């Protein structure tokens, strides 16, 4: 039994941008089955997660359909998931052949290569397909860990 009341009262949301329908119709219309997501973006990646926006995260990491119906919930975590010595605990893929599909999972650690012939991680033209974010606490408002 949903309530939709703990999201409108508080104002600690970074970007409360709904898509598909309005926020007022979410309390009256029934829903058959809801699906939630959980991921941490590198601050300036919230604008890329939109039905029509592109970049480096909404192409082969988390694809959003153009006819999506929901709401974006983002909030800062500069004190909950931040470390002054280093937060090397989150990575992201930046090398993959072709874009992904909406709501896909690509959990893998195989090396990246343009053609076939799977190479080894130690090579000259083959590198790791993932890279750590590197969240800090003494940076600007752009490089901050936001949970969307």
């Amino acid at each position: 039994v949903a309530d939709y009341s703990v999201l409108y009262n508080s104002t600690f949301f970074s970007t409360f941008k709904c898509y598909g329908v309005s926020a007022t119709k979410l309390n009256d219309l029934c829903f058959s089955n809801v699906y939630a997501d959980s991921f941490v973006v590198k601050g300036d990646d919230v604008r890329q997660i939109a039905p029509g926006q592109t970049g480096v995260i909404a192409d082969y990491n988390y694809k959003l359909p153009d006819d999506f119906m929901g709401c974006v919930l983002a909030w800062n975590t500069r004190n909950i998931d931040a470390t002054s010595t280093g937060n090397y605990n989150y990575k992201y893929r930046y090398l993959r052949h072709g874009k992904l599909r909406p709501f896909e999972r690509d959990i893998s650690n195989v090396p990246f290569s343009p053609d076939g012939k799977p190479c080894t991680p130690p090579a000259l033209n083959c590198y790791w397909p993932l890279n750590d974010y590197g969240f800090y606490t003494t940076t600007g408002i752009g490089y901050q860990p936001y949970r969307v």
């Epitope: 058959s32 089955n33 699906y35 359909p65 006819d67 999506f68 909406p102 709501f103």
Partner: antibody, heavy 122, light 110 residues
Framework: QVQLVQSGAEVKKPGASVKVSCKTS????????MYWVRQAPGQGLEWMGV????????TYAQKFQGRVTMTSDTSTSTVYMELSSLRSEDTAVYYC???????????????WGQGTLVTVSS | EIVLTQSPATLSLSPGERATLSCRAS??????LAWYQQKPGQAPRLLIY???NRATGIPARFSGSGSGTDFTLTISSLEPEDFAVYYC???????????FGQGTKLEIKR
């Protein structure tokens, strides 16, 4: 490779119920929209027939609302269609196709089955 | 529901030319159109989804277009194994609806 194997032919009396299955294999059958179509001889197919395998949500068309009832099985990974009140204009080949997107999204058909010839006569 | 109307409904051309398949809707719908390719006797096959992206396994000779209410399918080079009936599917947004057209036969000109 993704492939959908169906049953063979099945003749049914004009007024009984038909039970046609759609076996899927080759992929993780947990988050994928399943559809159903049937091309009539000379005419075409126009209805959604989308059923959620994971959840228990079903969707039917306007002309076929209380005549068709579908169900899914997360254990055997095979959906079942139950169309009651068989008419003389529904005797055609029934197909079941998957979706290109996942459950939250929706797209066109990408993987088709093989066909199930259903006939309603003597 | 949005109905699909096909005025030509037929296209008799020779292998090597370009196709002029059309798919027009009733109202001013979005670009959520997807064509198909169903060989007579075999199972249907997806050709172009969302009217702006190429499907998997489809060669480079197939390239669709269209925006809003003027959609068309232009084939680069016709192949003898590509002569079949093509259906376009239109999808709605809110009530998870999907509508199909009528189909256009493509017979080899002789």
């Amino acid at each position: 490779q993704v492939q959908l194997v169906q049953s063979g032919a099945e003749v049914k009396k004009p007024g009984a119920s038909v039970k046609v299955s759609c076996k899927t294999s080759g992929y993780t059958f947990t988050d994928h929209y399943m559809y159903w179509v049937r091309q009539a001889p000379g005419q075409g197919l126009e209805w959604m027939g989308v059923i959620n395998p994971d959840a228990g949500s079903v969707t039917y068309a306007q002309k076929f609302q209380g005549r068709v009832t579908m169900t899914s099985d997360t254990s055997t990974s095979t959906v079942y269609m139950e169309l009651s009140s068989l008419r003389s204009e529904d005797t055609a080949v029934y197909y079941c196709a998957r979706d290109l997107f996942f459950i939250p999204a929706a797209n066109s058909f990408d993987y088709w089955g093989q066909g199930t010839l259903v006939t309603v006569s003597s | 529901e949005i109905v699909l109307t096909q005025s030509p409904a037929t296209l008799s051309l020779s292998p090597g030319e370009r196709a002029t398949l059309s798919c027009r809707a009733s109202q001013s719908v979005s670009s959520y159109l997807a064509w198909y390719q169903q060989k007579p006797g075999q199972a249907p096959r997806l050709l172009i989804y969302d009217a702006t992206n190429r499907a998997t396994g489809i060669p480079a000779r197939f390239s669709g277009s269209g925006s809003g209410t003027d959609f068309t399918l232009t084939i680069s080079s016709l192949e003898p194994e590509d002569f079949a009936v093509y259906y376009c599917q239109h999808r709605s947004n809110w009530p998870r609806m999907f509508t199909f057209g009528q189909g256009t036969k493509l017979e080899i000109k002789r």
